[PDB]
Amino acid sequence: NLRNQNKLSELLRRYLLGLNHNSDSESESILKFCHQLFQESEEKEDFFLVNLESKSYTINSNSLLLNSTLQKFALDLLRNVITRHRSFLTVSHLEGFIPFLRDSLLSENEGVVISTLRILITLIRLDFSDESSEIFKNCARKVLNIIKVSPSTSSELCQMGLKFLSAFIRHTDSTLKDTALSYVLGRVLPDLNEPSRQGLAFNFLKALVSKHIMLPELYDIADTTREIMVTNHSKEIRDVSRSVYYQFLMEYDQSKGRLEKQFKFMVDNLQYPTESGRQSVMELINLIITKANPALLSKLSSSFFLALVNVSFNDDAPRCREMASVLISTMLPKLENKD
């Protein structure tokens, strides 16, 4: 039953943890072992006789469950060894496993595929031959097919694909067509309204801005995430969201009317009711103050300064009052004489 499968999963997980500290893991025999696990997975008579059984045996099949379970273990073990010991992360040692990785990618269960994505993300930097390199291109195609069938991006398999898709763009020379990215960003936008389980996608969003790929939806990303900064409560989401939106602003081109509206938001957001929401804006304001063009600072000196003293004059949270006073302190020395 499923419950026992969870129990068996827990036990199998512990064995892997022990294998990590095991001195054998430093030995090369383990790869031959993992390879071993990889290939291991893939009437007239009755008219006389007396029969006295009343219960029929139910048709059932678990042999598939065995193969998936062994494959999940093997992939899980294989990723641990290469991550821990760098020398095994070389082209020569892992050539034999590439055909198995391709099989597992098409494997039904997503847990094994998730592992297949994890190990692949390790190997994107690693060089490979002609036939061992197509796997990266093919896996890029598959994860889009994963996003296809998935009703919602907020699934464990879906995030891991974006993580791979981000790392695919960041490192590998070949890049996907803009239309595919547009749809992926389209699918990310609604599910992004629940950032709590979207943590990986932000890194993929961070990937595109890092490469400065131009998409129409990316402007819509910037507006939604800026709201997430001052609204979502998890600090981790606020931190990553701050980077991408701030990264989006200082690079991507924007019309002058647009620029004022965002800077219009942040000064307004300094009056946000929740203290953390006011706090989360402060780092962004401070980032502008810490690093920005003097001309940009000069246009904004009067606006930011008094919004800062205002909160510093009246604030239900002393810390925000303290931070606002501090940001003024690091503000004034940089200000121009006229400002």
Partner: peptide
Amino acid sequence: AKDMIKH
């Protein structure tokens, strides 16, 4: 949208 990402 299903068709665009297909290509």
